[PDB]
Each structure stands twice: as C-alpha cells, then as structure tokens.
C-alpha cells in the first residue's frame, strides 16, 4: 500500500522535530507558543510532508514579520 | 423423450469429468461427493437449495410425466383412458374387488404424495373418499397381500422423543463429582456447575446470591427448581453469567441449574420437572420496531 510515494526519502525526525525550523524567535513569547502548537499539530499530521510543513512555517514567518510593527 | 437419455448420458460423462477434476476414482463416487464438489467449485449465497446450483440425475430432476398412453394406431393401452382419472379409477376398482372378495370369504399417505406417485391430480374430497375406502378395508380382516398393499401407501409415523436430554456427570481432582449445564435467555447466557455431595452456599460470578440479587423474586426464581424437586440444602453450585437484565440473568441461571440437576436426579423427576415447565428456553424476545410505527406494535394516532 506504499508501492511508490516514498515522500522523497523524508524522515520521521524531519517531520516531527521542527526546532531547526524554529530559530528566529525567543522561547517565551506568544509567537513561540503559537508556533510550538503549530509544530505539534504538524508532527501529529501524517497527511502532509516536510515540504508542506515548511511552507506553512515560512508563511507564518512572513506574515507575522510584516506584522512585526507591534510585538506586544 | 430421447432428450431424457441424452441428459442421462451427459450427466454420466459430467460426473466422470468431475471425479477426475476433484481427484477421485470415478468408479467409487457418491451424490454427497457431487454436492460437496459443486458447492466448493461454484459457491452461492442463495438461501434456497432449489435456487442454488445443483448437479442431479435427470430422472429426479424432471418430474414424472405420463408416457404416450395410446399406441400409434387406434385403441389406447389402458381401459379407462377415454375418461380422466384412469389410474385412480383402476385402483378403486381393484380395491372394491378385494373388499367384496373378503366379504364373500366372511401412517397415512399425503395427497400430493399420491399425486407424485401417480401422474394425475385430484380433489381433496376424492382423496377423502379414497381414505374412507382404505379405512373401510382395514376395519375388517386383511390378509398379507392386503396389508402389504396398504403399507405400500402408508408411511412412517416418525414419532419424536418427548424427553429431556441428560448431561453426563463428570469428575475432577481430589475425587470431586459434579455436572455442568448451560442456559440462555433474551440477551443473557450463563453456565452452572452443580456438586451433588456439596451443599449450602452458592456462588455467582464469584459473589453470593444473597448480595448479588438485592430483590427477592430473583432468589425465588433461582430457588424454584430446587423447591420442586425438594432437594434444597443438599446441592451447592457455581455459575458464570453474561447478560444485561436482572430477571434475564435470573431465568438463565434457573434454566442452567435445572439442566444440571436433571442429570443427578432420576428421569422420573426430570419428567415431573418437564410437566412443571422449567426445562425449556423462553423463545420470547423483544419484538422488532417497525418503520412506520411508534413501536413494535403501536401505530401513530389515526387522525381521520
């Protein structure tokens, strides 16, 4: 039932451990809270791959970085 | 008509081929083998046997049809042909001849069974008249020929047992005799082991009845078997149960205790218990709910 579709040789740690994708914010802030919850949900999700997860991450990064005007 | 023999020989060669396929010598081979083979080679979820696939001999496949009863020229063979019911009339004539012969000297067979024995239909009251003739013959003396003539038609009574099965006693370690039995109910199923020499307390799933059944009627029900036989405090029992309803479990354990005690007690007492009516599983179960009805039997209000 997986004859093909190897997910480009992806790895479970690449799916779950997103701490390397999480570098550009401290350990305490609400953005940290939200992005930690996001990484949790993504690791729980098997349907999507590391590609989709990193696109999600980059989208969040872009949006709250153009909303960096507040940081409150 | 040759079609029949053609089908017969086709069936023979097909039986040979089928024996070859299933891997058995074609000489030794049986209808049971035919049935099992066709079932394995062409299964079908059809419920009716007549609808399921069957490989059968043509003689019993086709119903018996009356062959040509008149020759190719002129007269017919039998002497009642110009009227119907020729075989029945000839049989009645022979019967009446035997009756008057005996006069000067001095179970039953179903209608459709007689029909399929013959090649003719008839009426219910005609059948009744034939039965009247037979019983009139039998009210008087009858020789060996007459008895065998009548028993050609008469069939086996096929009487039932009208008896309660006896479960076998058993023995286990440290020389302990006992007997196990099983009972069921609406949705509860249980099984109980009775020790004949033991007596006193009783267990239910590892709990005594006094505190497992807070209500009194359940204990009354499970006591009712012992009370009827009158052996009350001379038998201890264990039992396991699985069910939803309290009274359901009660009836299940009652039936199981009875089916265990009938083994120890005499068959006379078992017959007495059957007459009492505590040795039969209740066939009654919650009726289904219908789609248009508010319940299994109650309809919506007829509004008019």
């Amino acid at each position: 039932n997986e004859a093909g579709f190897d997910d480009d040789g992806s790895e479970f740690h690449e799916h779950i451990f997103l701490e390397k994708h999480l570098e550009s914010f401290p350990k305490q802030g609400p953005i940290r809270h939200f992005m930690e919850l996001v990484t949790c949900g993504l690791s729980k999700n098997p349907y999507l791959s590391v590609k989709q997860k990193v696109e999600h991450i980059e989208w969040f990064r872009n949006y709250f970085n153009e909303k960096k005007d507040i940081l409150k | 008509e040759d079609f029949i023999k053609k089908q017969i020989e086709e069936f023979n060669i097909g039986k040979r081929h089928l024996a070859n396929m299933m891997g058995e010598d074609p000489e030794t081979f049986t209808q049971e083998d035919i049935d099992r083979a066709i079932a394995y080679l062409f299964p079908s979820g059809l419920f009716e046997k007549r609808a399921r696939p069957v490989m059968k001999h043509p003689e019993q496949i086709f119903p018996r049809q009356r062959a040509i009863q008149w020759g190719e020229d002129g007269r017919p063979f039998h002497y009642l042909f110009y009227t119907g019911k020729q075989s029945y009339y000839s049989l009645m004539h022979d019967v009446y001849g035997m009756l008057l012969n005996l006069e000067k000297h001095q179970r039953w067979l179903i209608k459709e069974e007689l029909e399929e024995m013959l090649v003719e239909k008839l009426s219910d009251l005609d059948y009744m008249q034939f039965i009247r003739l037979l019983e009139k013959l039998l009210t008087s003396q009858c020789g060996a020929a007459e008895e065998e003539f009548v028993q050609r038609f008469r069939r086996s009574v096929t009487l039932e047992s009208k008896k309660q099965l006896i479960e076998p006693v058993q023995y286990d370690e440290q020389g302990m005799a006992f007997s196990k039995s099983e009972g069921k109910r609406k949705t509860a199923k249980a099984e109980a082991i009775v020790y004949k020499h033991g007596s006193g307390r009783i267990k239910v799933n590892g709990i005594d009845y006094q505190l497992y059944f807070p209500i009194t009627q359940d204990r009354e029900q499970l006591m009712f078997p012992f009370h009827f036989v009158d052996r009350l405090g001379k038998h201890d029992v264990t039992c396991t149960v699985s069910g939803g309803g309290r009274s359901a479990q009660a009836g299940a354990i009652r039936l199981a205790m009875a089916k265990a005690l009938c083994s120890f007690v005499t068959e006379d007492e078992v017959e007495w218990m059957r007459q009492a009516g505590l040795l039969t599983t209740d066939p009654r179960v919650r009726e289904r709910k219908k789609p248009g009805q508010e319940g299994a039997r109650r309809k919506f209000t007829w509004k008019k």
Binding site: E2, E11, H15, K44 | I13, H17, Y40, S44, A51, M55
Partner: protein
C-alpha cells in the same frame, strides 16, 4: 448466415488436464465447460434454466479453476522456493526469549484501481519489561511516566504509532522513541527524588 460449431464437450476426454484448460481465474463459459450442472429457481412442472444462458453462474464467483489437483501441483512446485522455519523456535516462551520485541503492522486489500489507503501507516509493538529493564528505579520511573500503555496483568508494555504516513517512518520513529525513553528513564531529577 454463419453457424457456430458444436461445443467442446464431446471433444474433451474424461482424462484431461483441467488445471491446464483453466489455469487462471476466468468466467464459466458453458461452451468450454462440459458439466451439465444447472442453477436457477424452478417453475412448477419445470427445472432450473440450463447452463447455456445461465448468467447467474456468471455473476456468482467462479472457482472451476484452482481444483485440489491444481493446488497440489502448484504447492509441490513452489516448495522448491519455500524455506524452513528454525526448529529451535517451537514455543511462545522460547521465541519471545530469543526476540522479545514484538512488532506488528497490517493493511487491507480491496477491489479497485487505487491501492493506497491511510490505514497502511499504523503499526504497534509490544514487549514485556520483566527481563528488559534490569533495574527498579528506572522501572518505577517508566511505569509512572506511561499512563495506560502498559498491562501488568499480562505484564507487557504495548505502544502504537501512526503519526507518520510511511510504515518505515513509523518504524524508525517508534525505535527512536523507545531508545530515548529508555535513556531518559535511566537518569532522574531532584524534583523526582523529592516525592
């Protein structure tokens, strides 16, 4: 205008390689099959419809192929390829001793063009901690950590994994999780010493 030749029934002999004439799964084809078996609900003074136009036999599953003889031949042919089980492994205690870590996956198979189905990813594993931990502090620690993944009546810890779509991803993640779990149960903390 054109006329069809009579069937192969009279042509086929009583001694015949039925496994060869029906090697694989195929329809009934009464023209090829000589058996006069019929199937159908009979009418009063009637019989089931003959095998020729009997599409009931067609719609039902087909098992004329794969007779016991064909099965025998295929099995004795494939025995050349089949291997032997280790005779030393002949009991549950012995096999669980030789290889305590039990692991089991599964997958359905269904008719259709597609074959992927998400349930292929799930897998689980089992192991008894009676012989694996070799200590007591880490044992109490691990049994305090795990909430319901154990069963002391059976004396086995069992764990599932489905977080990954791939079976091999699931396997590797389960192995890494077990390893890190053992390594973290090995040590302790001061708030854990204070209880």
């Amino acid at each position: 205008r054109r006329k069809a030749l009579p069937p192969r029934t009279e042509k086929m002999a009583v001694d015949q390689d039925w496994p060869s004439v029906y090697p694989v799964a195929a329809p009934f084809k009464p023209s090829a099959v000589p058996l006069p078996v019929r199937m159908g609900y009979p009418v009063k003074k009637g019989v089931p419809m003959a095998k020729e136009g009997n599409l009931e036999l067609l719609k039902i599953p087909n098992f004329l192929h794969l007779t016991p003889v064909a099965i025998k031949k295929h099995c004795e042919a494939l025995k050349d390829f089949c291997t032997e089980w280790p005779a030393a492994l002949d009991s549950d205690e012995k096999c669980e001793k030789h290889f305590p870590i039990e692991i089991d996956s599964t997958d359905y198979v269904s008719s259709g063009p597609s074959v992927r189905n998400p349930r292929a990813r799930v897998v689980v594993l089992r192991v008894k901690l009676s012989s694996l931990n070799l200590d007591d502090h880490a044992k109490k620690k691990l049994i305090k950590l795990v909430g319901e993944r154990y069963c002391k009546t059976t004396d086995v810890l069992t764990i599932k994994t489905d977080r990954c779509p791939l079976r091999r991803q699931n396997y590797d993640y389960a192995v890494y999780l077990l390893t890190v779990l053992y390594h973290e149960s090995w040590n302790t903390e001061e708030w854990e010493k204070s209880k």
